[PDB]
Design a protein around this ligand. Structure first.
Ligand SMILES: [K+]
Lengths: 66, 1184
């Protein structure tokens, strides 16, 4: 279990949990076509640039830790 | 109340996510394997006609995330590697003899889903086909080796690990090395330091690295051989051909730049991305490429890279020795923003747009030899290159594939005069948005359209000679005169035809080998090929009521039901019979079968009377004008038509019913259908070189026999008044039809029935439209992010024009006269739009019958409408009001709003104009408006408010603020209120009439990112999901409506089903007259589906066992588990995947025999029982 990225333990901080589920969410957006479509329709940006910003939000999400 | 459903697809997804090209058939022909969302599709563009035909279409029941093709050394056929949401990689081979994808290989490495660290998102192949690399977004990368055995069959190896912890992958690409050790270049980014620095300094100055992974074949292991940091983050790479053709290396596309960076001693070469002259976009916004196409030749090679503005550039690399000298870009053309492009041999370019229709162009010129500027990386500047966008001058549009993606709203209603409801679909992307009307039937190709004066009532098409392979005249009968036209390849009006119609005409035919006959109420006019006219006055004060013409016979019916018969001698003239027969009543319609080639006359004559009976009369001289057989009819006849395939007598009644009856000495067997709402007219037409009949009621239906099996398929077209067969050089086999005040030359080219469209272009992306009951018109709201309003476009364009002169260049240059003059077509050259807080919203009143827009209301700069409704208030009279919910200064990410507004309009002139009543403000965005008991329910933020109409503003009458997050939609039965939370599913709210107090009396036990919903009854709601799911939630029968972890009594979820495509419209409606109600849904990928209830438990058990059998005997093509796929987020509850079940017909015959025999049936029985669902709830045009 420990070697699966996204797994948690007793000393897991809230920041680790939510950066985990945030990266998971971004990759899920990358996967499911109609999700990336909904997002690329909401904000008037092409699919390519939406994917690019989703990749930039991979080490950025929730900002730096404490 | 057990509710079991059954899903089926009617219009498969039209949006394209991937597109590859190659010799998939194993021949010289190149095909295009495209991937829709969950459907793999094989298309073939024709080098002759230039049309794209769908060779194959298979539903893979899984999320396709990457699509690549490869070929082994010395090979002649391209395989298909598919990276899916399964934990498996699959290699497929198309088989032309069997028209199916044969799964060659399938290897299992991870878990299912679009996971973070499970490979399947990225897929790069060695250009020599020796190895394939499938990789996840983070941390995991696997490489398989491909080698064919002695039998020349592809074989796969064990996976080779190439993992690297804490690594994010932007893009993977195989490097073209000339049979060296395979190389896989990819963009990586290590976030290990960014997560261990609470200051954020490690987050910054952390750039991505281009890394080359080598596959040591001799040592059988992959190693991170090379790596170098990049100056700026790149979005994707391009394989540069190496070895014998070109120098090896990769092209890194980057924000405002492109960088060839081959490894070794090759220096990095960069070139700025050229920008259009005088960009209306915000200069703070960058520019990237969205896709790239590569064309390789033994002589040369080039690239085609498209930008965010749809700018395709032809990128070329000059080279000396084994090194590259410069990157030379040149402006090629502009097309819509494509998710993929394919450059094919014989000069064709396939452009699969990211949204909207797809296109196929023909490469006329390579883009060189013109005088346009060609930019190079060696050119010094510090400033970027600028170019002028122009219309298509290197490509010609050869085919256009209609795509409904993305469908944002859908109302299935009968707004036209026809009886079958139409699908009114609000769908599109920005400037290429549209409101398309969908009718399921046969596609009609409009050859010509010309309006006619007065009210035309008939039309015919007559040849000049019997041996003429093309018609000569088109006759149009009005009330007081008839117009004659000659199809002289110009369709000029003629006068010397001889018909000389100063009266209406009843018929026009070719009698002799060259003689023409016109039948008019005052008598009969014969016109020889030689211009001789023989007239025939009507006896006495009578007039001829009806007629039936033939190649060698002319029967007529006059007032009082008096028949007169004329037969042509072999000497070319007409002789009247020596007797005139009277009927029991007046004649209303007659038909006379065509004469067989060998015989000299037709025997049978069908005569329908006011007596509501049809009668057969022999024309043989042995029993001339003698009764043969009578037949009673349920109503008065309107038209008759005898036709062969075996003789059939067709009856169309004054009520919309049609009847086919067998014929010979006596007429016996019968069948009938309701075609009704309109009297059914019957016209002879020539379809596929055979005689077909055309019925005309609420729609135009085509009845034609097919392998001794009839078909009655309606035309996806408006109502028509008359039609006749047509044949010219312009249209060899067509139909001339007159409709109300219009003449139309049409053609029925395609034979298969599908959802056909008529598109009404819009300006911005539509969010919702509402049906005005009286006007039957549409009120559409069109809202777009990052956009300028028209006034801002004008003032900004002009501001640029002013700033142009301030350069003080010898002041003598007026380029503003060319800049302010030409407004580039926003639909093709992309929308000039930019800004993070900027918006553009427009209200539009459109008539759905035609394409015209009745009214247009342009809103302010940063105002964005998200809700709209049409209703009346109890305090006011019967005056219709239009409420539009708008938002102000929307920062979408991160979310922050300034406020909202609600516009109120008076909608006067029965829905033709909007006049401004008042604009009432509010603190949060209102995204939900619904009429409720003479008042309007408005959802502002998480607050559900009851509003009434005031003379100054919309007065707040009630409010509820215990809703969890944010109101996305609201629908109300007369008493209850169903709220759709953005995240927390559905909330049940009762409105107390005494106090105006909204009380939450129920909610859901599961969180649901709701997109849309529809109330199935007083207790059940069907809801869609942002993640592509559909559910049905039902209140328990013991729910108490009057009350005062969230709420006490919960609502149970009785249906869960993952569609796989995000649904944005649910509607319970009947698709065809006589059928049953179905739950028709639309989706964001341009697809239409239905959910269907079972009528008996026996059928439920049957189709369920079919599902269980096909799950194991016919597993999904990309290694996905069907039950797991449909249980993506919630386990399946009471749904049978009919798309899986209908693949029973695609299995091998032995599997059909095994599955059918397991169910104690035969394969044909299973197939028919599967067809019964479509017969009951969908379209079935089988006419016994
Ligand atoms: K009657």
């Amino acid at each position: 279990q420990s070697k699966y990225i996204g797994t948690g333990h007793a000393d897991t901080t809230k920041w680790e949990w939510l950066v985990n589920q945030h990266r998971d969410s971004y990759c899920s957006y990358m996967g499911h076509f109609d999700l990336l479509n909904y997002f690329a329709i909401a904000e008037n940006e092409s699919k390519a640039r939406v994917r690019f910003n989703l990749m930039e939000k991979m080490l950025q999400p929730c900002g730096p830790p404490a | 109340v057990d509710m079991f459903l059954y899903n089926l697809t009617l219009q498969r997804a039209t949006g394209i996510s991937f597109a590859i090209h190659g010799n998939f058939s194993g021949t010289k022909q190149q095909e295009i394997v495209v991937s829709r969302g969950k459907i793999l599709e094989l298309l073939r563009p024709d080098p002759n006609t230039g049309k794209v035909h769908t060779l194959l279409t298979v539903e893979v029941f899984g999320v396709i995330r990457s699509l690549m093709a490869f070929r082994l050394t010395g090979g002649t056929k391209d395989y298909i590697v598919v990276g899916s949401d399964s934990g498996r990689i699959v290699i497929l081979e198309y088989q032309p003899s069997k028209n199916m994808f044969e799964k060659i290989h399938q290897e299992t490495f991870g878990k299912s889903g679009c996971r973070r660290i499970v490979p399947g998102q990225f897929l790069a192949v060695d250009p020599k086909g020796r190895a394939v690399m499938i990789s996840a977004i983070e941390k995991q990368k696997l490489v398989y080796i491909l080698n064919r055995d002695a039998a020349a069959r592809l074989t796969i190896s064990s996976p080779l690990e190439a993992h690297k912890a804490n690594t994010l992958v932007y893009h993977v690409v195989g490097v073209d090395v000339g049979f060296e050790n395979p190389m896989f270049a990819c963009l990586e980014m290590d976030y290990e330091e960014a997560d261990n620095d609470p200051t954020g300094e490690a987050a910054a100055n952390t750039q991505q690295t281009l890394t080359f992974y080598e596959l040591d074949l001799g040592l059988n292991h992959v190693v991170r051989k090379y790596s170098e940091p990049l100056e700026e983050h790149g979005n994707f790479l391009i394989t540069v051909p190496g070895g014998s053709d070109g120098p090896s290396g990769v092209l890194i596309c980057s924000e405002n730049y492109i960088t060839y960076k081959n490894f070794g001693d090759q220096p990095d070469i960069r070139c700025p991305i050229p920008r259009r002259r005088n960009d209306l976009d915000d200069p703070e916004r960058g520019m990237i490429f969205v896709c790239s196409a590569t064309h390789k030749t033994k002589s040369m090679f080039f690239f085609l890279a498209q930008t965010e503005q749809g700018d395709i550039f032809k990128i070329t690399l000059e080279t000396d020795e084994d090194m590259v000298t410069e990157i030379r870009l040149k402006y090629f053309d502009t097309v819509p923003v494509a998710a993929a492009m394919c450059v094919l041999k014989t000069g064709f370019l396939f452009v699969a747009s990211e949204f909207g229709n797809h296109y196929l162009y023909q490469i006329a010129h390579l883009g060189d030899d013109d005088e346009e500027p060609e930019f190079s990386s060696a050119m010094p500047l510090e400033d970027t290159f600028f170019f002028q966008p122009r219309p298509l001058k290197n490509l010609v549009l050869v085919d256009e594939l209609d795509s409904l993606s993305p469908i944002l709203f859908c109302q299935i209603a009968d707004l036209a005069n026809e009886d079958t409801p139409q699908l009114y679909v609000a769908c599109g992307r920005g400037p290429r948005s549209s409101l398309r009307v969908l009718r399921h039937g046969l596609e009609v190709s409009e050859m010509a359209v010309s309006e006619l004066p007065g009210n035309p009532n008939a039309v015919w098409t007559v040849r000049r000679h019997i041996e003429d392979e093309f018609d000569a005249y088109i006759i149009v009968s009005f009330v007081n005169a008839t117009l004659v036209l000659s199809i002289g390849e110009t369709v000029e009006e003629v006068t010397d035809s001889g018909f000389l119609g100063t009266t209406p005409t009843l018929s026009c035919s070719l009698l002799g080998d060259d003689a023409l006959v016109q039948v008019y109420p005052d008598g009969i006019r014969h016109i020889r090929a030689d211009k001789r006219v023989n007239e025939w006055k009507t006896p006495g004060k009578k007039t001829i009521v009806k007629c039936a013409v033939n190649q060698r016979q002319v029967v007529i019916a006059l007032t009082g039901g008096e028949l007169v018969y004329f037969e042509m001698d072999p000497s070319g003239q007409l002789n009247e019979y020596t007797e005139r027969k009277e009927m029991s009543a007046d004649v209303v319609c007659m038909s006379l079968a065509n004469v067989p080639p060998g015989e000299q006359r037709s025997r049978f004559l069908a005569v329908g009377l006011v007596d509501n009976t049809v009668r057969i009369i022999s024309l043989d001289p042995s029993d001339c004008l003698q009764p043969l057989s009578m037949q009673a009819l349920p109503a008065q006849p309107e038209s008759l038509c005898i036709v062969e395939m075996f003789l059939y007598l067709n009856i169309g009644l004054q009520n919309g019913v049609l009847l086919r009856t067998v014929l010979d000495p006596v007429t016996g067997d019968l069948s009938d259908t309701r075609t009704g709402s309109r009297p059914v007219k019957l016209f002879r037409v020539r379809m596929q070189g055979q005689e077909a009949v055309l019925a005309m009621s609420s729609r135009s239906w085509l009845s034609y026999s097919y392998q001794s099996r009839f078909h009655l398929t309606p035309l996806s077209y408006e109502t028509l008044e008359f039609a006749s067969g047509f044949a010219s050089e312009q249209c060899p086999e067509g139909i001339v039809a007159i409709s109300t005040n219009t003449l139309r030359i049409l053609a029925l080219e395609k034979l298969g029935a599908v959802f056909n469209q008529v598109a009404f272009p819009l300006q911005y992306t539509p969010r919702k439209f509402v049906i005005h009951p009286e006007s039957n018109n549409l009120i559409i709201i069109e809202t777009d992010h990052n956009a300028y309003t028209e006034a801002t476009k004008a003032q900004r364009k002009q501001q640029m024009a002013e700033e142009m002169v301030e350069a003080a260049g010898e002041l003598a240059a007026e380029m503003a006269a060319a800049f302010l003059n030409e407004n580039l077509p926003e639909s093709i050259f992309g929308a000039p739009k930019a800004g993070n807080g900027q918006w553009a919203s427009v209200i539009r009143v459109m008539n759905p019958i035609q394409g015209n827009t009745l009214d247009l209301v342009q809103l302010e700069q940063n105002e964005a409408a998200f809700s709209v409704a049409v209703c009346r208030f109890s305090n006011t009279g019967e005056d219709w009001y239009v409420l539009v919910g708008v938002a102000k200064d929307l920062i979408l990410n991160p979310r922050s709003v300034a406020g909202g507004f609600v516009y109120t309009y008076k909608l006067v002139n029965n829905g033709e104009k909007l006049e401004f009543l008042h604009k009432t403000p509010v603190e949060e965005v209102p995204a939900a408006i619904a009429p409720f008991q003479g008042r309007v329910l408005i959802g502002v933020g998480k607050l559900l408010r009851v509003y009434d109409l005031g003379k100054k503003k919309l007065l707040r009458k009630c409010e509820n603020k215990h809703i969890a997050n944010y109101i996305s939609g609201i629908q109300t039965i007369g008493h209850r209120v169903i709220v759709s939370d953005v995240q927390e599913s559905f909330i049940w709210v009762r409105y107390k009439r005494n106090e105006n107090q909204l009380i939450i009396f129920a909610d859901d036990t599961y969180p649901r990112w709701v997109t849309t919903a529809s109330l199935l009854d007083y207790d059940t709601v069907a809801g869609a999901d942002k993640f592509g799911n559909i559910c049905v939630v039902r209140l328990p029968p013991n729910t108490n409506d009057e009350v005062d972890n969230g709420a006490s009594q919960k609502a149970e979820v009785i249906m869960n089903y993952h569609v796989g495509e995000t649904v944005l419209s649910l509607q319970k409606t009947t698709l065809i007259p006589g059928g049953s109600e179905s739950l028709v849904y639309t989706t964001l990928s341009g697809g239409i589906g239905i959910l269907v209830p079972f009528t008996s438990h026996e059928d439920h058990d049957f189709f369920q066992h079919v599902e269980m059998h096909l799950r194991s005997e016919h597993p999904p093509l990309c290694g996905r588990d069907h039950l797991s796929f449909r249980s993506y987020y919630f386990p399946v509850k009471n749904v049978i995947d009919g798309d899986l079940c209908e693949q029973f017909n695609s299995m091998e015959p032995n599997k059909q025999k095994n599955v059918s025999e397991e169910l104690d049936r035969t394969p044909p029985e299973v197939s028919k029982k599967l067809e019964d669902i479509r017969t009951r709830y969908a379209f079935d045009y089988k006419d016994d």
